[PDB]
From Swiss-Prot, chain A:
Species of the source: Saccharomyces cerevisiae (strain ATCC 204508 / S288c) (Baker's yeast)
Main location: mitochondrion
Gene expressing this chain: ATP5
Protein name (database record): ATP synthase subunit 5, mitochondrial
Subunit structure: F-type ATPases have 2 components, CF(1) - the catalytic core - and CF(0) - the membrane proton channel. CF(1) has five subunits: alpha(3), beta(3), gamma(1), delta(1), epsilon(1). CF(0) has three main subunits: a, b and c.
UniProt keyword Protein transport present: no
Domain of life: Eukaryota
Function: Mitochondrial membrane ATP synthase (F(1)F(0) ATP synthase or Complex V) produces ATP from ADP in the presence of a proton gradient across the membrane which is generated by electron transport complexes of the respiratory chain. F-type ATPases consist of two structural domains, F(1) - containing the extramembraneous catalytic core and F(0) - containing the membrane proton channel, linked together by a central stalk and a peripheral stalk. During catalysis, ATP synthesis in the catalytic domain of F(1) is coupled via a rotary mechanism of the central stalk subunits to proton translocation.
Any one of the GO CC terms: mitochondrial inner membrane
A matching Pfam family: OSCP
SUPFAM superfamilies: N-terminal domain of the delta subunit of the F1F0-ATP synthase
Compartments where found: Mitochondrion; Mitochondrion inner membrane
Keywords: ATP synthesis, Hydrogen ion transport, Ion transport, Membrane, Mitochondrion, Mitochondrion inner membrane, Transit peptide, Transport
From Swiss-Prot, chain B:
Name this polypeptide is given: ATP synthase subunit alpha, mitochondrial
Pfam families in the cross-refs: ATP-synt_ab (PF00006), ATP-synt_ab_C (PF00306), ATP-synt_ab_N (PF02874)
One annotated GO molecular function: proton-transporting ATP synthase activity, rotational mechanism
Biological function: Mitochondrial membrane ATP synthase (F(1)F(0) ATP synthase or Complex V) produces ATP from ADP in the presence of a proton gradient across the membrane which is generated by electron transport complexes of the respiratory chain. F-type ATPases consist of two structural domains, F(1) - containing the extramembraneous catalytic core, and F(0) - containing the membrane proton channel, linked together by a central stalk and a peripheral stalk. During catalysis, ATP synthesis in the catalytic domain of F(1) is coupled via a rotary mechanism of the central stalk subunits to proton translocation.
Keywords carried by this UniProt record: ATP synthesis, ATP-binding, CF(1), Hydrogen ion transport, Ion transport, Membrane, Mitochondrion, Mitochondrion inner membrane, Nucleotide-binding, Phosphoprotein, Transit peptide, Transport
Subcellular localization(s) per the UniProt record: Mitochondrion inner membrane
Impact upon substituting G254D: In ATP1-2; growth-defect
Residues annotated to bind ATP: G169, D170, R171, Q172, T173, G174, K175, T176
Positions of modified residues (Phosphoserine): S20, S141
UniProtKB/Swiss-Prot annotation, chain D:
Phosphoserine PTM positions: S334
Catalytic activity: ATP + H2O + 4 H(+)(in) = ADP + phosphate + 5 H(+)(out)
Protein name listed in UniProt: ATP synthase subunit beta, mitochondrial
Annotated Gene3D superfamilies: 2.40.10.170, Bovine Mitochondrial F1-atpase, Atp Synthase Beta Chain, Chain D, domain 3, P-loop containing nucleotide triphosphate hydrolases
Sites bearing Phosphothreonine, chain numbering: T73, T198
Subcellular localization, as worded in the UniProt entry: Mitochondrion; Mitochondrion inner membrane
Keyword terms: ATP synthesis, ATP-binding, CF(1), Hydrogen ion transport, Ion transport, Membrane, Mitochondrion, Mitochondrion inner membrane, Nucleotide-binding, Phosphoprotein, Transit peptide, Translocase, Transport
Misc note: Present with 164000 molecules/cell in log phase SD medium.
Length: 187, 507, 470, 469
C-alpha cells in the first residue's frame, strides 16, 4: 500500500493516483508535471479560482480540461487521466487538494520527512543546524528517511519553540510554561 | 464534500490507469460491499428492474435498487456464502414461478420448490410474480356464494367470490382458526362436482414458524383437505426478500386458477408480517422514508396485491380468486399505518374482539366493527330472508345491553330486547374447528328470529341447537333436503319449518 | 424541436432519475415519455437536481426498466384530451381510453396543472341545489356552485350515497357532471360502469351528461396523486370553454391525501403530522381553489372524504374541513338504526343554512326540527334508564313526533333498489319544507310511526298509513 | 497463511479491520486479535470493501491501538461440545468459567448453524404436567413445546423459572441445558450452588445438566452470541447425541436488546421504538434454531422482560409469534400478591383444545375464564356504585370470582423461603377436580381468605378450621 495512507475523501483520488503511478513508476515525474501545471493554474486568475469553482457542466468542464492540456502539452498522462477523472467526478475545487496530497505521498515515498520548528521569532542558523543535527541523531528521526525541517514564525507563541514531526513533538515553549505556572499560583 | 459510490479506490485507480472494464458493466458485475444481506455490486448496466441475478456463490437475488453506479441486489440467501469481489451474472429474468394443478397437495416455498418434499411440482405453466390487476372490463359483478360455515360470518357479513374481506384483530387470537373454518367448509363443495363451484384454497403463511405450519398441515391432512389445497409458505427463517416475494407469487398461483376459469380462495396470513419484512427490506436498502416505521409505498405494495383478486366476466371464463387478508393489530390500534391502509383497500372488515373471545364466542366476531360492503349477493336467498332483522335485533341488543349493566328498573320494551338479545348472542356462539351446513343454519336462525328460543332458558340454548338439528334430521329431513335443493324459503316451507320449530319449543 | 433524450440513472421506486444532456433541460412539471413494451411510461418532472439530472415521479409501473433508457420529453405538463367526447368515455390517468372505444379527443388537449382562478374571477353563489333527499334538503341545504363535502366513515355505502346523488341530480339538472375516482376499487369501478349504463346516464348510443375518470389504486402512488388533477381539468374545460355549469364529483379525497403523503416520502420530504406530507396544505389548497364558481361558469364539487377510524381530529380530514363549503356527516350508528340515508342530521353542518339564503320559513322550520331532534336525543338517556313514563306529556309528544320525524328522514333511494328493493323518491324542496312543518304541528300524528319509515313525501306517508291500516 | 490485518477503526465495540492481504474472511468468520489482556474474539459482520470489514467485538474493548495485528480464525466461533459439556459453566467462547479446566472436546461446532428443515419438523402433543395450579388449568404445557413468560420484573421471572427447573427437570431424566443470557451474576451463583446442592450438577459425580451463563455486565456483543452458543450445545444433544433435552433461556429480551444496541453502530438506521431493522430476521433464526425435530424433542422455556410491561412494543410482539404457549406474568397480579403472577386472561396454549385435554377440562377452564372476565368487567361499576347495589345474579358471580381469584394462588417450593410459606405442588388431576367443585359452589360457604395463598381444596378446608379458631 502507498507510503502513508492519509485516508480522507479527495485523498482517495490521491491514493488511487499514487498506486497507479507507483505500479508504472515515474511518480516524481508525475508529481513534477502536476506541480507545474498546478502552479501556472494558480497563476492564471480566471481558472485560478474563478473557473476552479463549480458552475460548469461536465461538457463545459471537459472543454476546460482541453484548455488545461494545451497549457502544458504532455504532463505524464496518468495525471491527464486524472484530469478526465476530475472532470467526470466534476470536482476541480479539490484539485489543489489532490496536488498537495500526492506531494505528501510522493515525498513520503522519497522519504523526505519535512518537519517544523514553530517559534516566536526567526531563529539563529546555528540554532537551526544544532536542532537539525540533534533531530537527525535522535530516535525520532533516526535518519534513513531524509529530514527536512522548517522553522516558522508564529507570534501567538510567546518565547521558546516547539519541534514537531511524526505526531511526536517536544513542546518546550515559554508561553505554556508561564500558563502552567500562573495557574498553579492561582491555586 | 461529495462522496460518490464511484470513488471506490479500486474503481478509481483503474480509471486513473486509463483502461477500465466494460461488459462487467453489462451482463456481469463485481460485488464491492455486502453485508446485512444487501449487496451493492458495481456493473450490470444491462440490468432490467426487478431482475433475478445469479451471484457466483450461487445465491440468487432480485435487484430492487438501480443506483447511479451500484446495483443493490437483495440476496435470497445468507451472506455467509456471498463475499466481496464476487462476479454476479444476470439471470436476465424477472422472477417467475411454476404454476399448475400439481400445487394441489404441495407445501411449496416461494420459488416453488416442494418443502413438504412430495417430489416435483406438476406445473402446467410458469408465470411472473407481478401481473397487473384485471380491468373493469374483465370484471363482472359478484353472484357467487362463499359460505364459511360460521353462522355469524355468513349471516351478518356474507362473503362471495371475488370479494376482498379483511380479517383484522389482535395477535394470535387463533387468527388461523378463523380462516381454517372457511377451508373446512370448502370440503362440502370439494366432495361435490363442478370445479368452478369448488374453491381451491391457497393458504399463504408468511413469517410463521415451521412448527406452526406443520401443525396446520397435520390438521388439514386430518380433515383430508390437503387433497384440494395448496400451502405456499415462507417461514420466519426464510429470507426477507423471499417473504416479500411470497404474497405476490402466491397471487400468481391464484391467477392460474382464475385463468382456468375456476374459483379459488387465498388466505394471506399475515400481510402484517409482509409489511415488517418490507420495512426491514426497505431500510436495509437505504430506502429513505421511515413511514411511521413502515416505508412509504407499503400501501402501493398491498394495493397492487389485493386488486388481483376479482370476479371476472363470462367472457373471461367466469374466474374468481377470493382473498382474505389477515392483519394483527397491535393493541387493537387500527389507526396504525398498515392497518389503516389495508382497511381502505378491502371491501369488508371482519373485526375479532378479544373480550368477546373470553366471553365465550369462539370464534368471536365483533359485529359492530365488522362490515361487508358488498353484502348480500352471495348470501343464500333463504338465509337473507331469515337474518333480515337479525341485524336490527343485535343492534338494539347492543344499546339495551349498555343500559342493562347499570341494572336499573327496566322498560318493558328494553327487557324484551334484553331477554331476546341474550339468547341471540348465545345462539350465535361458535365451536372451533366445526363448520355447519347452511341448510342447517337456516333453521336455527328461523327459530331464533321468530322468537321461539327467546323463551327457552339461556343455559340450555347450547343443548337446544344440537337437539333441534337432530330432531329435524330425524323427522323433517325432507324439509332439510328442500332447503338444500331450493335455497329460498317458500310460504309452505316457512310454515312447515314454523310448525316444526313450534313443536320443538317444548321439545 | 428535436428529441430531448435522457438516460435513466437510477430506478429506485417511483423516483426515477434521468440524465438529460446539456442545453435541453426540461422544466418543473413537464411530462417525459419513455417508450416501453408497456406503451409509454409517463414521468412527471418534479425536481432539477443538478448537472442535467432531474428527479421525476412515475405514473406507470417501474418494473423491467433497463438502466440508461432513452427518455423523450413532451415538454409540458401531462396533456389530457378535452372535448364533449370526454362525456361518456372512460380514460385512465394518462388520459388513454380504458373503455376501449379508441381515440377520444375533440380538437383540444389541456395541461393537468392549471393556475387557480383569480380573486377577480370569483363570483359568489346563492342558488340552492335540490338533492330530493329530504334530510339533506331541509337540514343541510346544498347550493349550486358549492363545495359540498361528504365526510364519512369507511365506504359506508359511501359510494351508494354518491350514486344516488348522480342518479337523481345529474339527470335532473341539464349540466354536465364529472365523476373522478381516486384509486377506487375495480369492483366499485365495474359497478359504477354497470350502474350508469343501467340508469342510462351513460348511454353508449347517445351522449352522457357525465364523463368518467376512474382511477384505480393498483396504479403507482404518483398516478394516484395526479389523477385528481386530470379530472379537474376536464371540469375546467366544461366550466370555462364549454361555459356550462358542472357538478363535479371526486371520490375519495382521503386517497388524494394518502397518495400525496406517499410521494412526499418518496421525494424525501420530511413528513408532517401523522406522517402526512409537509406540502399537504398547499396541495389540498391547489385542488380546492381551482374548483370554484367564476363568471365563466359554475362548478359544484361533491368531494367524498373518508375519516380514518372515524377520527376527524386527524389532520387530513381537518385540513379538508376548512376548504369545503357544505359538510355532510354520514354516521354508522344511523345506518345501523336502519336509516338510509345514513346522514346524521345534527352532526351535518352546511353554512348555506343561513336564514336569508333559504328563506325565513325554511330556516325557522329547520330550527324547530333541529331543536326537536336535539331534545329527543337528550331525552333518549332519560327514556332508556330512568324510564319512558317519567317523561312529561310535553316531552312525550316531542319524543313521539321525533320518532316519526326520525323515520320520516328515512326515504328509499332508487339505486338502492339493488341495496334494498323499495323505489326511491325525489321530493321537491317546497314539499319537504311543508311536510316537516305539518309533522311538527302534529297534523299527521294520527299516522303510524312505521308509516313514516322508509317512504318519501307526506303523500306517501298518508298512503302508507292506509296500507298499515289494511 | 493467516490473514493479517490492522485495526482501522474502533468506534465502540464494533471494531473495523483492514486486511492487508487480498484474502478476505467471509461474513460470520471469526478473527482473533491477540490482546495483551488475553485475546479478543471478533466476528466479521459486514464487508464494507476496500479490504475493510466491520466486525462485532465479543469481549470488552479498551487499549486497542489502531493497526494492531489481526489473525483470521475463520468461520463462526466453534465451541467444543460433547457429553463433557455437562457439568461446566462455559463462557461465550466456550471456555469453562467455573474452572473445571478445558473441556475434552469431541466435536467442535460453529456457533451459527442453519435452522432445521420443514421436513425435519415433527409435531408432538404429549402433556407435560407442571403442577402449578394456574398453569395446569389454564394453559397446559406440552413436552417438546416452546413455553413463554412475558414478565416485567425479573425478580418474579427468575422465581418462575426456578420453580419450573425444580419441578420439571427432576422428573426429566434426559440432558438439559440452562442458558442464561444477560442475567444477574448473583442470581447465577445462586443457581450454580442450588443445582450443585440438588445434585443435578454433581461435580465429583456426574451432571445431566450443562450450563452456559452470560452475565448482564458482559459487553452487548458478547450477549448477542451467548444465545447462539447455547443453541449449539442443545443441537449437539438433540442431533448428535440424539438425546431428548430441555432448554431454558432467560432473558431472551436481552438477545433482542443486544441487537438493538449494536444496530446503530453497525450502520443501520433503527426501526420503530428503537429495535433494529433486522429484528424479524434475527429473532426468526434464533427461534427456528430451537426445534423439536424427528431426531429429538427439546422442550424450551423462554423468558421475556417486556420493557415498561408494554406488550404492544414490537420486540415483545415478535417474540409472541414463535411460541407454542405463553403465560404472561404481570405487575397487576403481583400487586394482588398472587404468586404465581400469571394473568389468567392473558395466557394461551395450543394444547388448550378439548381434543387434547378433554372436554371436561376445557369446560371447567371455560367457566373460570368467563367468570373472571365478568369480574373484570364489573370493576368500573363496583367502584362507581356499591358492590351491594349490583344485581343478585352478579353478586353471586362476584363472590365466586373473588374466590376464584384467590384460589388461583399456590405457594412455590423454591420460593417457599421467599414467600415464607411451605411450598405447595398439586396434581393436575386434583386441580381439575378441585376447580370443578368450587365452580359448583360446593366449597362456596367458607372464608375468602381461606382460598388466599394456599394450595388444594383439602388445604382450604383445613385452613377454614384454622381460621375458625
Amino acid at each position: 500500500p502507498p507510503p502513508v495512507r492519509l485516508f480522507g475523501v479527495e485523498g482517495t483520488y490521491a491514493t488511487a493516483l499514487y498506486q497507479a503511478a507507483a505500479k508504472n513508476s515515474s511518480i516524481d515525474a508525475a508529481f513534477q508535471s502536476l506541480q507545474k501545471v498546478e502552479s501556472t493554474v494558480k497563476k492564471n486568475p480566471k481558472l485560478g479560482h474563478l473557473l476552479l469553482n463549480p458552475a460548469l457542466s461536465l461538457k463545459d468542464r471537459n472543454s476546460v480540461i482541453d484548455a488545461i492540456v494545451e497549457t502544458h502539452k504532455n504532463l505524464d498522462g496518468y495525471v491527464v487521466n486524472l484530469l478526465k477523472v476530475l472532470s467526470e467526478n466534476n470536482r476541480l475545487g479539490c484539485f489543489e487538494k489532490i496536488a498537495s496530497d500526492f506531494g505528501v505521498l510522493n515525498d513520503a515515498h522519497n522519504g523526505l520527512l519535512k518537519g517544523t520548528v514553530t517559534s516566536a521569532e526567526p531563529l539563529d542558523p546555528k540554532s537551526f543546524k544544532r536542532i537539525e543535527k540533534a533531530l537527525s541523531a535522535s530516535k525520532l528521526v533516526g535518519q534513513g528517511k531524509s529530514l527536512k525541517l522548517e522553522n516558522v514564525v508564529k507570534p501567538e507563541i510567546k518565547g521558546g519553540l516547539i519541534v514537531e514531526l511524526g505526531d511526536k513533538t517536544v513542546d518546550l515553549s515559554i508561553s505554556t510554561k508561564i500558563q502552567k505556572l500562573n495557574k498553579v499560583l492561582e491555586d | 464534500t461529495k462522496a460518490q459510490p464511484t470513488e471506490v479506490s479500486s474503481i478509481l485507480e483503474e480509471r486513473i490507469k486509463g483502461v477500465s472494464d466494460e461488459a462487467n458493466l453489462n451482463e456481469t458485475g463485481r460485488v464491492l460491499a455486502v453485508g446485512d444481506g444487501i449487496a451493492r455490486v458495481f456493473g450490470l448496466n444491462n440490468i432490467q428492474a426487478e431482475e433475478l441475478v445469479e451471484f457466483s456463490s450461487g445465491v440468487k437475488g432480485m435487484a430492487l435498487n438501480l443506483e447511479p453506479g451500484q446495483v443493490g441486489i437483495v440476496l435470497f440467501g445468507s451472506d455467509r456464502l456471498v463475499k466481496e469481489g464476487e462476479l454476479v451474472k444476470r439471470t436476465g429474468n424477472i422472477v417467475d414461478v411454476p404454476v399448475g394443478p400439481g400445487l394441489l397437495g404441495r407445501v411449496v416455498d416461494a420459488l416453488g420448490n416442494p418443502i413438504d418434499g412430495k417430489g416435483p411440482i406438476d406445473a402446467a405453466g410458469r408465470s411472473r410474480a407481478q401481473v397487473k390487476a384485471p380491468g373493469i372490463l374483465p370484471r363482472r359483478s359478484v353472484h357467487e356464494p362463499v359460505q364459511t360455515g360460521l353462522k355469524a360470518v355468513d349471516a351478518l357479513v356474507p362473503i362471495g367470490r371475488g370479494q376482498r374481506e379483511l380479517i383484522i384483530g389482535d395477535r394470535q387470537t387463533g387468527k388461523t382458526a378463523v380462516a381454517l373454518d372457511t377451508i373446512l367448509n370448502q370440503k362440502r363443495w370439494n366432495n361435490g362436482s363442478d370445479e368452478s363451484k369448488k374453491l381451491y384454497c391457497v393458504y399463504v403463511a408468511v413469517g410463521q414458524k415451521r412448527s406452526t405450519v406443520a401443525q396446520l398441515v397435520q390438521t388439514l391432512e386430518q380433515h383430508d383437505a390437503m387433497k384440494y389445497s395448496i400451502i405456499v409458505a415462507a417461514t420466519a427463517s426464510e429470507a426477507a426478500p423471499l417473504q416479500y416475494l411470497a404474497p405476490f407469487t402466491a397471487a400468481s398461483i391464484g391467477e392460474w386458477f382464475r385463468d382456468n376459469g375456476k374459483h379459488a380462495l387465498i388466505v394471506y396470513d399475515d400481510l402484517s408480517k409482509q409489511a415488517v419484512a418490507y420495512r426491514q427490506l426497505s431500510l436495509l436498502l437505504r430506502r429513505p422514508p421511515g413511514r411511521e416505521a413502515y416505508p412509504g409505498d407499503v400501501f402501493y405494495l398491498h394495493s397492487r396485491l389485493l386488486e388481483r383478486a376479482a370476479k371476472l366476466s363470462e367472457k373471461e371464463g367466469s374466474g374468481s380468486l377470493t382473498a382474505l387478508p389477515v392483519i394483527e393489530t397491535q393493541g387493537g390500534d387500527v389507526s396504525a399505518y398498515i392497518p389503516t391502509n389495508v382497511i381502505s383497500i378491502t371491501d369488508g372488515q371482519i373485526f375479532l374482539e378479544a373480550e368477546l373471545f373470553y366471553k365465550g364466542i369462539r370464534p368471536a366476531i365483533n359485529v359492530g366493527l365488522s362490515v361487508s360492503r358488498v353484502g348480500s349477493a352471495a348470501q343464500v336467498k333463504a338465509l337473507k330472508q331469515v337474518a333480515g332483522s337479525l341485524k336490527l335485533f343485535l343492534a338494539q341488543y347492543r344499546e339495551v345491553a349498555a343500559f342493562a349493566q347499570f341494572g336499573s328498573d327496566l322498560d318493558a320494551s328494553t327487557k324484551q330486547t334484553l331477554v331476546r338479545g341474550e339468547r341471540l348472542t348465545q345462539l350465535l356462539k361458535q365451536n372451533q374447528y366445526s363448520p355447519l351446513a347452511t341448510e342447517e343454519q337456516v333453521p336455527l336462525i328461523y327459530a331464533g328470529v321468530n322468537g321461539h328460543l327467546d323463551g327457552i332458558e339461556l343455559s340450555r340454548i347450547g343443548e337446544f341447537e344440537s337437539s333441534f338439528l337432530s330432531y329435524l334430521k330425524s323427522n323433517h329431513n325432507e324439509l332439510l333436503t328442500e332447503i338444500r335443493e331450493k335455497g329460498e324459503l317458500s310460504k309452505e316451507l316457512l310454515a312447515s319449518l314454523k310448525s316444526a320449530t313450534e313443536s320443538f319449543v317444548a321439545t | 424541436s428535436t428529441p430531448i433524450t435522457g438516460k435513466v440513472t437510477a430506478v429506485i421506486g417511483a423516483i426515477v432519475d434521468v440524465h438529460f444532456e446539456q442545453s435541453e433541460l426540461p422544466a418543473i412539471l413537464n411530462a417525459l415519455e419513455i417508450k416501453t413494451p408497456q406503451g409509454k411510461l409517463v414521468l412527471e418532472v418534479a425536481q432539477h437536481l443538478g448537472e442535467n439530472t432531474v428527479r421525476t415521479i412515475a405514473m406507470d409501473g417501474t418494473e423491467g426498466l433497463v438502466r440508461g433508457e432513452k427518455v423523450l420529453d413532451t415538454g409540458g405538463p401531462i396533456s389530457v384530451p378535452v372535448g364533449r367526447e370526454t362525456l361518456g368515455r372512460i380514460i385512465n390517468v394518462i388520459g388513454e381510453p380504458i373503455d376501449e372505444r379508441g381515440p377520444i379527443k375533440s380538437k383540444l388537449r389541456k395541461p393537468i396543472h392549471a393556475d387557480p382562478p383569480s380573486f377577480a374571477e370569483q363570483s359568489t353563489s346563492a342558488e340552492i341545489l335540490e338533492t330530493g333527499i329530504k334530510v339533506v334538503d331541509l337540514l343541510a341545504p346544498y347550493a349550486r356552485g358549492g363545495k359540498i363535502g361528504l365526510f364519512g366513515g369507511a365506504g359506508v355505502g359511501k359510494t351508494v350515497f354518491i350514486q344516488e346523488l348522480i342518479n337523481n341530480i345529474a339527470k335532473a339538472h341539464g349540466g354536465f357532471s364529472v365523476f373522478t375516482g381516486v384509486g377506487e376499487r375495480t369492483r366499485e369501478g365495474n359497478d359504477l360502469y354497470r350502474e350508469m349504463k343501467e340508469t342510462g346516464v351513460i348511454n353508449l348510443e347517445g351522449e352522457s351528461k357525465v364523463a368518467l375518470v376512474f382511477g384505480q389504486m393498483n396504479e403507482p402512488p404518483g398516478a394516484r396523486a395526479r389523477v385528481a388533477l386530470t379530472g379537474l381539468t376536464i371540469a375546467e374545460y366544461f366550466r370555462d370553454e364549454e361555459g356550462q355549469d358542472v357538478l363535479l364529483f371526486i371520490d375519495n379525497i382521503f386517497r388524494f391525501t394518502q397518495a400525496g403523503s406517499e410521494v412526499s416520502a418518496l421525494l424525501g420530504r420530511i413528513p408532517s403530522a401523522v406522517g402526512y406530507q409537509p406540502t399537504l396544505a398547499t396541495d389540498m389548497g391547489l385542488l380546492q381553489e381551482r374548483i370554484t364558481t367564476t363568471k365563466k361558469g359554475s362548478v359544484t364539487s361533491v368531494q367524498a372524504v373518508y375519516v380514518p377510524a372515524d377520527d376527524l381530529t386527524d389532520p387530513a380530514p381537518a385540513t379538508t374541513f376548512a376548504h369545503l363549503d357544505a359538510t355532510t356527516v354520514l354516521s354508522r350508528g344511523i345506518s345501523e338504526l336502519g336509516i338510509y340515508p345514513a346522514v346524521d342530521p345534527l352532526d351535518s353542518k352546511s353554512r348555506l343554512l343561513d336564514a336569508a339564503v333559504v328563506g325565513q320559513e325554511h330556516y325557522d322550520v329547520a330550527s324547530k326540527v333541529q331543536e326537536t331532534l336535539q331534545t329527543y336525543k337528550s331525552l333518549q338517556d332519560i327514556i332508556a334508564i330512568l324510564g319512558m313514563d317519567e317523561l312529561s306529556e310535553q316531552d312525550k309528544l316531542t319524543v313521539e313526533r321525533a320518532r316519526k320525524i326520525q323515520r320520516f328522514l328515512s326515504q328509499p333511494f332508487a339505486v338502492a333498489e339493488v341495496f334494498t328493493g323499495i323505489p326511491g323518491k325525489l321530493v321537491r324542496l317546497k314539499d319537504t319544507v311543508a311536510s316537516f312543518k305539518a309533522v311538527l304541528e302534529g297534523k299527521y300524528d294520527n299516522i303510524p310511526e312505521h308509516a313514516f319509515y322508509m317512504v318519501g313525501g307526506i303523500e306517501d306517508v298518508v298512503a302508507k298509513a292506509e296500507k298499515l291500516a289494511a
